[PDB]
Amino acid sequence: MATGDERFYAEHLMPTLQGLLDPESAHRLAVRFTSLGLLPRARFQDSDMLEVRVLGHKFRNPVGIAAGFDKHGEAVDGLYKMGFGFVEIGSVTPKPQEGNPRPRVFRLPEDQAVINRYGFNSHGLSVVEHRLRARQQKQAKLTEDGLPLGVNLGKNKTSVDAAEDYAEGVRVLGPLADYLVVNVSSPGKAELRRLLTKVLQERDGLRRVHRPAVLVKIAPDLTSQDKEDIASVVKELGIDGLIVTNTTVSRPAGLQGALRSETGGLSGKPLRDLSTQTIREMYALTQGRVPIIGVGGVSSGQDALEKIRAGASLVQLYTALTFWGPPVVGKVKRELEALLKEQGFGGVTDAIGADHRR
Ligand SMILES: Cc1cc2nc3c(=O)[nH]c(=O)nc-3n(C[C@H](O)[C@H](O)[C@H](O)COP(=O)(O)O)c2cc1C
Ligand SMILES: Cc1c(-c2ccc(-c3ccccc3F)cc2)nc2ccc(Cl)cc2c1C(=O)O
Ligand SMILES: CCCCCCCCCC[N+](C)(C)[O-]
Ligand SMILES: O=C(O)c1cc(=O)[nH]c(=O)[nH]1
Numbered sequence: 320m321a322t323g324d325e326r327f328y329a330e331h332l333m334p335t336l337q338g339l340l341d342p343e344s345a346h347r348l349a350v351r352f353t354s355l356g357l358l359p360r361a362r363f364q365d366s367d368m369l370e371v372r373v374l375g376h377k378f379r380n381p382v383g384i385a386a387g388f389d390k391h392g393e394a395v396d397g398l399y400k401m402g403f404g405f406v407e408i409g410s411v412t413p414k415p416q417e418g419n420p421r422p423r424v425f426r427l428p429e430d431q432a433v434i435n436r437y438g439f440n441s442h443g444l445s446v447v448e449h450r451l452r453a454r455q456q457k458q459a460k461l462t463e464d465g466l467p468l469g470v471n472l473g474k475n476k477t478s479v480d481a482a483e484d485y486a487e488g489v490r491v492l493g494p495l496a497d498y499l500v501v502n503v504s505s506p507g508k509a510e511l512r513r514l515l516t517k518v519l520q521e522r523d524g525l526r527r528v529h530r531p532a533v534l535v536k537i538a539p540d541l542t543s544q545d546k547e548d549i550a551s552v553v554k555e556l557g558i559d560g561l562i563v564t565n566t567t568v569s570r571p572a573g574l575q576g577a578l579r580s581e582t583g584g585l586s587g588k589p590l591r592d593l594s595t596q597t598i599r600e601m602y603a604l605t606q607g608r609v610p611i612i613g614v615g616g617v618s619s620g621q622d623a624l625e626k627i628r629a630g631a632s633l634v635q636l637y638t639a640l641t642f643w644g645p646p647v648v649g650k651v652k653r654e655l656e657a658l659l660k661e662q663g664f665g666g667v668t669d670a671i672g673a674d675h676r677r
Pocket of ligand 3: 352
């Protein structure tokens, strides 16, 4: 057990844990350990180079934990201790729901990938609300210290009115979040405008200290038309940002994992460049004026900086954590800082969208 060390986790601890446990058991255990603060390190001290000011907030470093690891808001503080510059919880649905039957997550070790069809298993808004209320002032200090909190909002499976599910989440969790996320993406145009109009009106109805940024999270499987439409609505309505991307329902040629034909969203290395390209396109479509959080197959500084250069102001990872473990956070940050220096950027901020100016 005990402490590391990137090599010890990646070469020994994590693979052993994967050989003993199915992915959902290891996920639950990870959330357990993290929430108790049973973490190695973190020996990495964030430099001013890594600091980003975006979405009305200061981010100590641009490396966050993506939605889906901490679905129910149970490990937020342990995730900050892990070295993440921001935490996104969820997706959270209005009512509790169990999600899909098990097994519903599948490891593709040869591809450094996962396929998941959790189906939005959620403790629901009420349980999450109280859990965030119990630490609300602690979070206010973390946020002020440059460690913001995002809440990803979902909808119930049997929901009659999608927009109202999101509106409810906005009202309930919005006062507790630095930013909110609406998935247009889990595996309109006038309909999308309709939904996002409602979400933004609900957000604007909150008291001034309790007003989060609103971001839209997209899949990497959208047509060119979908992406044009989204960009257009985002700019018309003044959506605060985009998260790019969710998992893919595509199966790129070359996947080796025996489980590659499982239904669900694919994450990790095979998603990486598909996601970066979507960032590139969404940045150009929004004239570099809409903050993007880049997510999809990030496990190194190069991965992170490619997304930043492509137009991301911030990045997230998830699947890398499942293979490398907690030390992956400091690894990405250390490598990113070294790459920024090597490439003559003063900091992360100078690198945002740098490819578009070549
Ligand atoms: C186990 C699993 C569950 C996920 N659950 C959610 C979810 O609840 N809501 C969401 O927006 N994204 C969810 N995601 C997608 C991730 O947030 C992220 O967009 C995607 O995995 C790409 O990042 P990655 O390659 O670093 O994993 C999930 C991903 C995985 C691996
Ligand atoms: C190992 C692991 C892990 C995982 C991640 C982090 C840790 C960990 C956390 C706190 C301290 C020490 C640790 F090793 C343990 C285990 N998480 C997952 C999350 C979601 C899914 Cl689908 C799979 C996993 C897996 C896995 O591949 O089994
Ligand atoms: C989920 C398996 C986690 C096993 C790793 C245990 C973390 C080491 C704890 C380090 N420390 C002594 C500081 O608590
Ligand atoms: O809960 C899930 O099944 C899920 C949600 C989501 O937004 N993305 C994903 O890959 N899985």
